[PDB]
């Protein structure tokens, strides 16, 4: 219906960012800390933080307390297979 | 690469649209003429002709001239299957 496209815009709209899009990536490798990822990807914790933030509000990343700090995942397969056939359709000979 | 995740954030920047989300999920089910998705959707065939003009220089559809008019449809299966993933995981609950 009309509500769903606009979650789906909303979603979408949070993908359309070279940073978000390093973070969805490095998780569909492999979950990980706010540490982990800032120190990866060479970005500060803090906007690696509010980057999180809003991709979880949107339902693309969750949050497990494992230990003291939150690990983070990629929410669902959805989400997994929509970035991974994403990337490739990026990749592969397009003439 | 670095070049590959500027190229996936063009794909979904162009999909953070709700009119390019309705046309997008509108070929998901048939292909079709400018006219067709500018009757069903309710645009303007000028302003679908330009959303498409940018849905098709991030290759997320094609078109083909069939008679006298173009038909257009998704690129390929990985644009297909990276929408209906999205618009499940849009829908599906999420507590
Ligand atoms: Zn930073
Ligand atoms: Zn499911
Ligand atoms: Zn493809
Ligand atoms: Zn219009
Ligand atoms: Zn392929
Ligand atoms: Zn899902």
Same mark, same amino acid.
Do not use: C, W
């Given at each position: ?19 978000? !899009?390093?973070?969805?990536?490095l998780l ?8 982990? !990822? ?15 933030? *809003? ?15 939150? !690990? ?10 929509? *970035?991974?056939?994403? !990337? ?8």
């Amino acid at each position: 219906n009309t509500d769903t496209l606009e979650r789906v815009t909303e979603i979408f709209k949070a993908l359309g960012d070279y940073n978000r !899009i390093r973070i969805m990536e490095l998780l569909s490798v492999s979950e990980a800390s706010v540490g982990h !990822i800032s120190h990866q990807l060479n970005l500060s914790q803090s906007n690696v933080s509010h980057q999180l933030k *809003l991709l979880k509000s949107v339902h693309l990343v969750k949050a497990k307390r494992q230990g003291q700090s939150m !690990i983070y995942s990629l929410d669902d397969i959805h989400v997994a297979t929509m *970035l991974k056939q994403a !990337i490739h359709h990026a990749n592969h000979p397009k003439e």
